Design a protein around this ligand. Structure first.
Ligand SMILES: [Zn+2]
Lengths: 267, 39
């Protein structure tokens, strides 16, 4: 497992540090006291350097002992290709991140139509991960798919798509009846509580925020990733004021790209 | 009589819903073209 890899590389650097620090002790003692103007000042400098070197040796030995407490347990062509594959994969990950952070594309111009089967395959692929979210697709009105995403015992989100691109979302509480009299989805309602109206507003900013132009799978996957973080409503405190309640509201803002809780008044 | 009239109603509503979806896609194209016009 990877923790053994990290502990072994850690303890490798611990041995190298121990050896170099012992040699540094004996090298600084080889040179002897320097001059340093004031006699009192030169004595102080020599004593301080020797003490620091000894302390560093002790720290390195202690760290090696701590890793010891925590440690657990033609053919060359294949390994060369394996190493070069991992190298290319990591290199490409870094270069792709650096380049798509800073794109120079200004306009798409130079000089939506999808089978519903594809939408069902995509959304079932999202439903297979996140075992606490269940997504139930239905199409009461044409090709525009409507999704009920239940989330723990916490949320019921009604997502109204339009050609495999999220359009509207409505977040209601668990007990709340999301069905009309006839058992269809109540696409147009609100949720009787202050908290879930705030989370509808935050979800509309979430669907306005996660916008790739072309590829919509990253959009729906990232929206569900962000939505999954709301399972710690009523349990997470705000990361600005520490408390749970500002004006009788839990922290309704799970921040994009770092899913942390905030009261929206604490931005 | 009831079953025949229900089938006619369902045919009319399926036709209308498919019409709405096709018209909506055309409206999306026309909105992009009209709002992004330079003029
Ligand atoms: Zn706060």
């Amino acid at each position: 497992v990877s923790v053994n890899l990290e502990a072994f590389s850690q303890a490798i650097s611990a041995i190298q540090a121990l050896r170099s620090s012992v040699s540094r002790v004996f090298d600084c003692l080889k040179d002897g006291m320097r001059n340093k103007e004031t006699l009192e000042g030169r004595e102080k400098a020599f004593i301080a350097h020797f003490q620091d070197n000894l302390h560093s040796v002790n720290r390195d030995l202690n760290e090696l002992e701590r890793l010891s407490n925590l440690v657990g347990k033609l053919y060359s062509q294949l390994l060369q290709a394996y190493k070069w594959s991992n190298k290319l994969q990591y290199h490409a990950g870094l270069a792709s991140g650096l380049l798509n952070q800073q794109s120079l594309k200004r306009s798409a111009n130079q000089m939506l139509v999808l089978p519903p089967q594809y939408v069902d395959d995509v959304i079932s692929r999202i439903d297979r991960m996140f075992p606490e979210m269940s997504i139930h697709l239905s199409r009461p009105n044409g090709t525009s798919a409507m999704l009920l995403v239940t989330l723990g015992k916490v949320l019921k989100v009604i997502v109204v798509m339009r050609s495999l691109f999220i359009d509207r979302t409505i977040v209601k509480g668990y007990n709340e009846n999301v069905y009309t009299e006839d058992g269809k989805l109540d696409i147009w309602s609100k949720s009787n509580y202050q908290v879930f109206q705030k989370v509808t507003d935050h979800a509309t900013t979430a669907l306005l925020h996660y916008q790739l132009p072309q590829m919509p799978d990253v959009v729906v996957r990232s929206f569900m990733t962000w939505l999954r973080s709301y399972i710690k409503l009523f349990q997470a405190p705000c990361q600005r004021c520490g408390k749970f309640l500002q004006d009788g509201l839990p922290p309704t803002w799970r921040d994009f790209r770092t899913l942390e809780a905030f009261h929206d008044t604490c931005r | 009589r009831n079953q025949q009239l229900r089938t006619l109603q369902e045919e009319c509503d399926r036709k209308l819903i498919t019409l709405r979806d096709e018209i909506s896609i055309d409206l999306y194209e026309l909105e992009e073209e009209y709002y992004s016009s330079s003029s």
